[PDB]
Amino acid sequence: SKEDTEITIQKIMDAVVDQLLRLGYDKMSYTTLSQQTGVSRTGISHHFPKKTDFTAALDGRIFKMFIEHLEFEKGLDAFSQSWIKALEDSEFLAILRLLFHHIVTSESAHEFAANGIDRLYKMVESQFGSGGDKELEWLIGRSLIQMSK
Amino acid sequence: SKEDTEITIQKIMDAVVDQLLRLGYDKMSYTTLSQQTGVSRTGISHHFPKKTDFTAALDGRIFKMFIEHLEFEKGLDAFSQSWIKALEDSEFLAILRLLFHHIVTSESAHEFAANGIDRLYKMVESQFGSGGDKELEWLIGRSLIQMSK
């Protein structure tokens, strides 16, 4: 009697990922969820008692599709070039906005993001030696500025 | 009589400036402010019809607390290390959150933040020149990463 429930939690998260991306956590409501998924409000309450509870269960997919946009195999410059280039892509922008929002507002700073950032350091550190952490940090600065527009 | 309508705006402004950092923007509400002030939530909303009016209202009062934290008089690196050590003070961090939060959120909340950055930028440049642009950009980078820490 547990295969019936997970086939839904999954469908709730496949939606959570969509709305978080095109509406953002802020505008994504238990109602907009209830529409996208044919699941009743109290049916989503069941699995996710609080709204933070969404962002909580969120896992790999996001940061996996993030780093898609990005050049790790051609040295440090190539890679920033790739990231600034990447700043005019809406999905990319969205993905940042997302975790930028999350980091800024969420008390608990959920795992999806901790791993997220820490993964990128590991990558950048690994690929780009000791100049990486900073270059990366800066990229982040430049991005967050650009949203300030 | 039109003085007693000032005294009161200043009682809220004060309250705001406080609550804006003891609780963050998000959790601060007409209630909490009312509670802190002995002014009705209608009395407040009177002067400040929209919550984004509260941040518009400051006009610099925060930025002057902010800069008490930074070293402008000892070279660029000195200033930059001032900013890093400052991230460990929570008022300091609270001010950046408030900003970054405005960068990330609503259309309404937006002109305050677009405006604060240009202010940082102009701050740094007039102290240290265009060498300072990139240092600032890197500093926000770190700053935001620090907020997940």
From TrEMBL, chains A, B:
Molecular-function GO term, any one: DNA binding
DNA-binding keyword on record: yes
The organism's place on the tree of life at top rank: Bacteria
SUPFAM superfamilies, A to Z: Homeodomain-like
PROSITE patterns according to UniProt: HTH_TETR_2 (PS50977)
Organism: Vibrio parahaemolyticus serotype O3:K6 (strain RIMD 2210633)
Every HTH tetR-type domain range: 6-66
This protein's name: LuxT
DNA-binding feature ranges: 29-48
Keywords: DNA-binding
